[model samples]
Target chain A: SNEYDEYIANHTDPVKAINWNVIPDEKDLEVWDRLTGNFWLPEKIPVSNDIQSWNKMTPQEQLATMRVFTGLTLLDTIQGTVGAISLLPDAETMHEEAVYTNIAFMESVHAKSYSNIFMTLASTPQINEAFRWSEENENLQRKAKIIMSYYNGDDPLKKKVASTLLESFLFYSGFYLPMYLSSRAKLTNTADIIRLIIRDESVHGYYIGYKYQQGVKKLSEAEQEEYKAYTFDLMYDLYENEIEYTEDIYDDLGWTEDVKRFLRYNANKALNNLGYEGLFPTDETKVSPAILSSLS
Target chain B: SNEYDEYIANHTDPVKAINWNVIPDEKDLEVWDRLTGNFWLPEKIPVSNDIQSWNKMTPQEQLATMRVFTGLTLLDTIQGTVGAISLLPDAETMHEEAVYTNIAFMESVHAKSYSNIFMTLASTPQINEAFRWSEENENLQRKAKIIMSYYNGDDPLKKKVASTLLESFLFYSGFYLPMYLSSRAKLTNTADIIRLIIRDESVHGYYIGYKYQQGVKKLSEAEQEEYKAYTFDLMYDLYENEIEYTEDIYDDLGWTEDVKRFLRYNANKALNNLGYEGLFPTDETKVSPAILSSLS
Candidate 1:
C-alpha cells in the first residue's frame, strides 16, 4: 500500500515528491529526452533569407506578415510566462516537472524567435506598431483574456486540460495559418521562424495532451464532463476570436479564406491528439495537399 | 501606472509569465545559461572504479557507504520530485522558471547517479534493503515532514525562501557527510559522481539562496521576522534530528564528532548564504583542514 501510494496516488493536488526510480509512465522520460535533444537557440537560426526578401514583397504582404507574427508572438509570450510558468509548479512527478519546464523554456525560445524574426525583417517603428496593434486589437485581447482565465484559478486538473487545449488545438489552429503561408513561400523569413516554433509546439502539445489524458482518466465522470464542456466552450470562443483576428490581419491580402481552412484543419488535428473526435471535417477542396503535408 | 505595476505589485503571487525582453534580474540569466551548459547524462559517467573497489573494502565500510548513499539518493529524489518541482511553478519570471527547472532536472541526475553507484557496488537484495531502511527511518521521515510543510501551501514567496534554506543548508549539510567521506578516497568512483552532483548543487543552492534573499527583502519587517522564526524552528528541529541520525550512523565508527563539526560548519555557511550570521561559531579546530578546504 505504501509503495503504491508513494508513487501513483490519485488526488488533484500536485505530487510533492516523485519516486522517479519507479515512474508510472516511462514514455514521458523518452519525450523529455527528445525535447532536450531537439533544443535549438533562436539566435542560431539565421533569418537572412527572409531579410533579403522583405523589401521585395508587396506592402500588403509585408503588413499581413507583420500582423500574423505579432499575434503569434503574443500567444508564445503567454505560453512561456503564464501557461507553462503557472502549470510547472503543479506537475506531479519528476518526469512531468522536467518535461513541463522544458516546455516552458521552449515557449520562451518561441517568443524570442518571433522577436528575432522581427528584428531581421522589420524596422523599429514597424516593430513598435506591431506591439501597439497587439495591445489595441480587440480580437487578440479577447483571445488573451479567455486563455488567461483558463490559465488562472486554483484547479490543477482543469488548468492542465485547458492548457493542453490551448497549446495543442487553439495554438496550432492559429499557428498553422502562418505556417501554411510560410510553407508556400508567402512569408519566407517569418515562415522560417514559425516552422521552428511549430516543431517545438507540436512536441509540447503532444506531451501535455499525453499528460492530460492520464490526468483525465483519474477524474470522475462528472468532473470529466465538466472539463469537456469547459474545453468545448473555450475552444469555440477562441475559434471565433481567431477567425475574427485572421480576417482582420489577412483581409487586405485576400488570404482570410485560406487561413480559415488552415485553422479548421489544425483544430481537428489538435482534437485527434487529445484522444477525442475532431470538431471539423477533412475538407480536401479547401486545404491544399502541400500545406496539409507541411503541417503534418 | 504600467511601469509601477511592472516594477512593484503587492507581491500578487509572483509573476506567472516572464518578460524575457525586460529581464528584472540579469544575473539569474547567466546562472540559467550556465546550468544549461553544465547538463550531462549519468549514463556517460562510468562507475567502473567503484565496482572494482567493492570487493576490497571491509563489510563495515561497505555498509556505511551504502547507508550514506541511500540517504543521499532519497534526498536527491525528494529534491527533484518534491522540492524543485514544487518551487518551479511559483517562479516570478521566465528566468527563474528556467533556472528552477534546470535545477530539478539536475536533481534527477543526482538521484540517478546514486542508483548508478549502488548498481556498480551492491547486489539487488542489498539495494532493496537500503531502500527499506530509507522508508522506515524515523530521521528521514521527520526530515521530510518538516521540509515538506514549507513547500506545500499557498504562499509562493515564503515557500520558495523556505525551500531555498532547506536546499542550501539542511540538504547540503546532510550531503557533505557522504561527500566528505568520498573525497577522502573512500569509495573513489562514487566520489567521481559525488563531485559532479556537489558542483551542481553548490550552484543550485547559491542561486536559490540568491532568489530567497531577494524575495525576503520584499517582506515587511513583521513578515520577515515570522519567516525567520519559522526557519529557525524548522532548522533547529532538522539539525537536532540530523545530529541524532549522524550518531546512529557514525557513533560506532568513531567519526560522529567530526561529522557534527562538518554539520555546524555547513549550517553556518548556509546561513551566510542567506545573508544571515552563522548559527554556529567558526570552529576550524573541530573539523579537519582537509575537509574544510574541500568544501571551500
Candidate 2:
C-alpha cells in the first residue's frame, strides 16, 4: 500500500529492473564497490595458528572464548537472514536494494566464518554446548529482541536505526573478547578473522546510517526531531541491556570493566553513525590501545 | 504462528545461530560450497571487446537485442529481490537458508552484469528505451506476473516449484538471443558474460530443483500426486504463454521458429529438473547446434 514495501501489494507492482546507468545515490555505489572489494570467507584465515594458543588457555578461558564467539554467531544469524533482508523492502532506490543484497550475503559470510572457527578449535559437544548457551542466555536473547523489535512495523527510518545499532553498537560487546584475547597475543589468528568481519560491519553500519540520515532529511523537522529522540531512547535501552550481557559473559573472565569500556565507545560510534551526539562519558568510552591494535 | 515464518512472532522466538557441524542435510553444504566457489563479478569480464560487434548490427537488430537483455534484466531484478528471499523462511534447514543468501546476492550480480554490458554497448536513452520496452511488452509483463504470482503463497513446496521454474525455464527464452548472437559470432564477449550468468543459473536451477525433490519425498502419496498435477497445470499455462512471448520478440528477426524450439527444449529441462516427465514433444523441442555451441 506504501512506497517502502511494494510487496504489501504482493506481485501487483512490476518490479523495475535496476539500471545502474542512472545513479539514484552516489553513496550506494561507493559502498557497493567497497564491500564487494572487501569480500572474504573464513577459509582465508588460518585459525589453526590459534590451536596452540587455545591449548595453552585454562579451560575457563576456553569456555569464555567459546561463549563470546557463539554469542556473535547468533547475532550474525539475525543480521544475515533478518536484518538486511528487512532493509531491502525500504531501500529508496534499486541501487540501495542491491547494496543490501551484498550486506545480507556478507552477514552469512560472517556467520559461517564463526562455524569454521568452531570446527577448527572445538569438539562437537563443546561447540554444541556453546550454541545451546547462546540460545538459553536471557540477556543474549533480550538483546536479540531489542534489535529485532525495530525490524518489524512499517517505518523504514526506524528499521534503519535498529539495523545500524545492530551493525554498529550491539555487536561490539561480543566483538570485544576476540579483540581482547588478541590484545594479549592469544587467539591471534582467530582474531584476524573477527577483524575482517568487523571491517565489513564498519561499512555496513556507516552506509546504512548514512542512508538513515538521507531518509531523515526528507521528513518534516518535527518528525526528524522525533526520530532523534526515538534513536537515542533505543540506544539507551540497548546500552542498559548490553551492560547485563557484558557482565554475564565477561565477569567470569575478569574482563567485565574492559569490555564495558569497549561497549560504551562503540555505543557512541553507533550514535555518531546515526548523526547524534555521544551520550556516554569519555572515561568509559576510551578504548585500550592494545585492543585498538586488533581492529585493523 | 507457523514453523516456516518465525517472524510472524516478530522478535519473540529466539533465532538459533546455525551450526554447520550438525548439518540437517548434506545437500545444503554441497550447494553452499558449489555456489560460493562460483562467485564472480562483471568487472572480470572483457565485455568491451564486443563494442565492434555491437556497432555493426542494424538498428532493428540492435533494438531487438536491447529489448531481450532488458527483459532478462527485469527477470533478475525479481529473482534477486523477491524469489530467493521469499524462499528463505520456508527453507528446511539453516544451511539451506545460507545458500539462498548466496542466491539472492548473485541475482543482483546478474542484474548488474547486464547494466555493465549496456554501459559498454549502448547510450543512456537506448538503455532506457530498452527497459521501457520490457515494462510495456505485454507478454514480458505477463511472464513476470506468471512467475511472481507463485512466489507469494504460504505453501513451501509450491514456492520451491515456482522458484525452480523461474530459474530453469523462465530464463531460457530471454537467454536465446545472446546465444543466438554468439552463434553468428556477434556480441561475442557480451555473450561470454551472459554464458557465465547462465552457468550460475544452471547451478541455481539444479540446486533449488533438487531441494524441491527432497521436499516432495516427505509428502504423502496423495499429496504428492496433487502437487504433480498442480505443477503440470501451472507449467502448461506458462508454456502456452511462453509461445506468445517468443513469437512476438523473435518473429521480427525471422528467428521465431528457432527461439520456439529452444523454449520447448528448456521447458522440458525445467520439468526434468523438477523430476517430471517431458510434457513438450521433441519434434518441436530440438535446438539448433549453433546456440548449443554458444552455451559453453
Candidate 3:
C-alpha cells in the first residue's frame, strides 16, 4: 500500500491534472491541427464481445472469433515487447519501457488464449508458422516500435499525464462510451477481454491523471499558468500531428470499408461516451443500431 | 528460312550471350551485391502433418513445426507483393512499369493465398475473419491494382521490351534462383507447398528468359549495349544489398537463421542451374539433383 501510495505521491499535483484538459494557446493551435490532421479509420473497433456473445457462439465459432482478435493482439504484443526496449529513449523512458514490455506480455497472454481456444476448436494445426517467423524483419519491428513510440513515450511524467487524459478520454470513448451509445448491446467475453485491457489502461490513465492533478495542486497560480504553457508545448511535442505517421499502419496492412465503418462506429462511441458527442467531425449518428448490435 | 531468320534476328542477339567462363563487369558485380542483400531463409521448417506426428506433438512442437512456418509464408507473401512494386523504377521507366505491375498482381495472388490458408488453418471463424478483415484497407486492396496499370497499359511495344528485360532478371533472381536450390533438399511433406510454388516459379522463369533472349534480337549492337546497361541498372536496383537493407520478409517470421542459410544455399544453386555460374564471384554452389536429373 505504501509503495502504491509513494507512487501516487510521486504524482499528486492537482495543477497538472487540469493541464490534461488545457486547450492549446492561439500560437499552438496550428501545431495541434497538424498533429491531428491525418485522421483515417482506425485499424480495430471496440465492438462489444462480452460473454453472452461467446455463449451464443459454438465452441468452434467462438474459437474463430477469438483467434483473429487474439492474433492482432499478438501482433501488438510482438511490437510492444521489442519496441519497448529498442525504440524507447532511455533517460525518461525506463518505467515506460517496463510498462510497454508488460503490455506486450499481457497481450501475449490474450493472444495465447485465443490461439489455444482456436486450436481446440479446429483440432488441427494452422499454416505458415515458418514463413511468418522467418520473414519478420528489423524494419517491421522498427515500424511497430516506431508507431508505438509516437503515442506511447519514454517520459514518465508525460506518459502518465497523457495516459490519464487519453485513458479518461478512451474510457469514455471505449468502454463507457460504447456501452452508453449501444445501450441495446450485451457484454461478451470479447468485451471481457476489452475490459481486461481497460483495467491496465485505467491504471495507466489514473497514474498520469493523478500526477498531473498533483502538479496543478502544488503550483503557484502564476506558476500554474506557466506550467500550463509548458504542458501545452509538451503535449504538442508528444501528440500533435503524429496521427499522419501512425495511421498509415492501417494503410500498410490495407483497411477495408467494413473495417473503416467498424472503427468509425467505435470512434464515435468512444467520443460520445467521453462526453464529446457531436464534437467529432465525423457523423457516427448514421451508424445503425442493428449494425452495431450485430457486431457482437 | 528467311522468315525464321528475320524473327530470330528481330528478338535475340546470340552475341549478347557471353561465355560461361567470362567474368562479369563492374556493373554486374554491384548488382550481385544488391541481389544477395535481399536474401533470407524460408519462414519456417517443415513439420510432418501426419496425425501420427501432429497428435503426438506438444504445443511447443506444433508451434515450432507448423504455426511458425505458415506465419512466415504469409509475411513473405505480403513482402513479395510489395517488394516487386519497389523494384519497378529503373527499367526504361515506361516499359518496366508494366511488368512491375504484373509482378505486383502475382504477389497479390500470393497474399490472397496466404490469407485463405491462414483462415483455413485457424480454429475460429468470426474472430479470425473479423480481425483479418479489420486489418485490411482500401489503400492495400487497390495497391496491387494501382501498380498493375503500369503493366496493363496501351503501349504494347514498350511494355514488351520492358517486360522481357525486367522479368528476365526478376525471374532468375527472385524465383528460379531460390526454388532451384531448395528443391534439391529432400524436405519433409510439410514443405510440399514451397515445392509447388517452386514448380510454378520454374515456368515463370523459363518464359521470361526466353522473352529476353528474343527481345534482344530486335536491337542494333549500340542499342543492345544500351539495353544491357539499362538491364544491368535494373538488376542493380532490384538486387537487394545484403547489408544496408538486409531485412527480408522471412526474417519477420523469426526464421532469420534458417532463411539466411536456405537463401544462400538456394541462390548459389540458382546461379549454377541457370548457367549464370560465372556471374557469381563465389564458387560455393549446391547442386540440385531434382533439377540436374529432370526429364525436361
Candidate 4:
C-alpha cells in the first residue's frame, strides 16, 4: 500500500453559471448585440412575390436556382447542426459562447428559407428531386464530408478554418446564382432574403476568424507555422474541389468563368477572415460587378 | 483470424444533409415555426423604466430582487450552453435536431436579461455581490452539479429528465420573485420580458419531455419503469433542496410557506411536462393567486 502511487485523480467539477455582467471580452458583447439586433425569420420576407417572375423562367433556369439552393441547404445543415455547435467547446469566455450560440439557429433559418423559395415557386416534386440530386452530387458530398472531417478532429484552429471557409468560401458559388437572378430582375425578394443570409454569414465568418486569430496569437512560433501551412494547404485543397463543383454546374449557364472569379475573390476574403493574406490574386474587374454589387 | 472474423463495427459514416422538404415528423416543423416566429431579444424590452420602482424599494427589497435574478441567471446560463448543446447528440432525427438548436441562444437571452434588470435597477457592485452570493450558496451549486452530473452520463433519457426538470421545475422558484414584483406593478416590463422567457421555457421543456416520451415508448417494460423511478426520484431530490432554498431566502420576507405551495403546484405541472402524474397533491386554490395570474 505504501509503495503504490496515487491511482485516482478527480475528474468531476461543477458547471459554473456564466455571468454576462462580469464579461471580460467586450467583443462577444458587441457582436452579440449586433447579431441579435439583426435576428430575423425567413417567414417574414415576401418571397411569394417572385412566383410570377419565376413562372416566366424556362424549366432549365428554375432548375438551376433550386439546384444551387439544394446544395446550399446541405452545407447549411452541417453548419447549423455541427458547424457552430463544434466551436462551442473551445470558447474562451461564457460571453464568447453566447456570441457563437445564435449562429447555428440562423443557419437553420437560411437552410429552411431555400425550401420556402422552392415551395413557393415549385412544388414538393421539385423540392424532392432537388434534394435527391444534392444527395447524388459528388462535389457537394465531398465538401460537406470535408468540413465534417475537420469538425471531428481535436484541433480547434483547423475546425475554425473549415467553419470560416464553409461560411465564407464554399457557400459563395451557390450564392452566385440567386443574386445573379436578382441582377436579371428575376427573383428580387428571394435574393433579398439571400442578402440577409449573406449579411449574417459575413458576421459569422468575421467573428470566427477573429477568434481564430485570437487562438493563433497564443500558439508558439513553430506551432503557428504548422497551422499557417495547414490553413493555406486546406484552403488550396478546397479551392481545387470548388472549381470542379462550380465549373460543372455554371458552364451550361455560360457563367462558369465569372463564377470561378467570384470563388477566387471570396477565397481571398476567407483567408483574411482566418487572419492570413490571400493565396489567389483575384482582379476585381474580372469578377461580375453586377453579381458583386448584389452581394452588398 | 478465423475466430476474430468480421470484428469491425463501422462507426464512421457520412453525415447526411437534412432535407426539410421530406420531413417524417411534422411536430418539429410545427414547433420550429412557433419558436422562430416568437424570436426576441431582451434589448427590445425596456427595463429602464423600473428605475423609479427599484429606487423606491428598501435595501432588503432591492437585494431580494437582485438575488432571485442572480439565481435565475445561473440556471439560464447552464440551460443555454450545456443544457441545450448537450441534447443535440441524442436527437432522433435531423428535423428534431432543428427544434432543439435555437434554445441555447434564447436561454442566453434570458440569462442576460437578468443582468439587464440588475444593471438598470441596481449597479455592478450589487450585481457582483449578487453573483458572489450565488457562488457561495451551497444549494445553488448542488442543484447545478446535480443537473450536470446527468448531462455527463451515458443515458440520454436520464439527461432529458435532468434537462426537462431544469427547464420546467428548477426555474419556477426563481421565477416567482420577478412575477411577484410585477403583481405589485413594479418591473412590469421586466416581467413582460420574463413572461416571454417563461413562454420559451414552456416549449423547451415540452419538446424535451415530448421527445422523451417518444423515446420511452421504444424501450422494454422494465427499462421504462427504471427511467420513470429515476425521473420522480430526481424531481423529489431537487424539490427538497428547493425547499431549503426557498425557506432560507423567503423567511425574512414571510413568503416562505406561500412559495412552498407554489413549488408544489409547479412541481405537479413539471411532472405533467415529463408525461407523469404529480407527486405532490397541490390544489391551485392553496397557492398564491397573485403569482398564478402573473404567469399567463
DockQ values for all predictions? 0.20, 0.47, 0.01, 0.36
lDDT of 2 by residue, B1-296 (tens): 21213553455566698888888789889889988888888998898888998998878778888888888888899898888998888888998888899899999999999999999999888998888878777778777776666676667887888888888888888898888888887898888788889888988988888889888989999999988988887788777878898887778788889888888898788889999988888888878888888886
lDDT of 4 at B119: 72
Q: What fraction of native interface contacts does model 1 preserve?
A: 0.09
Best by the DockQ measure: 2
What TM-score does chain A of each model score against the native chain A?
Answer: 0.87, 0.94, 0.38, 0.94
- lDDT tens digits, residues B1-296, model 1? 32123322332332222334456788777886677666666666667766656777667666766676777777776676567767766666666765665676577667767776777668877777777777777776656555555566566655665565566655644455555665566666566666677678778777777777787788899998886766566556667888888887777777778878877877776666666777776754267766656655
| DockQ metric, candidate 3 | 0.01
lDDT of 4 at B177: 84
Candidate closer to the true structure by TM-score (higher is better), 2 or 4:
4
Q: Against the true structure, whose TM-score is highest? A: 4
lDDT scores in order:
0.67, 0.85, 0.34, 0.82
- What TM-score would you give candidate 2 relative to the actual structure? 0.94
lDDT of candidate 2 over A87-126, digit per residue (tens):
9888889999888888888899899998999999988889
* Comparing 1 and 3 on lDDT, the stronger one: 1
DockQ score for model 2 = 0.47
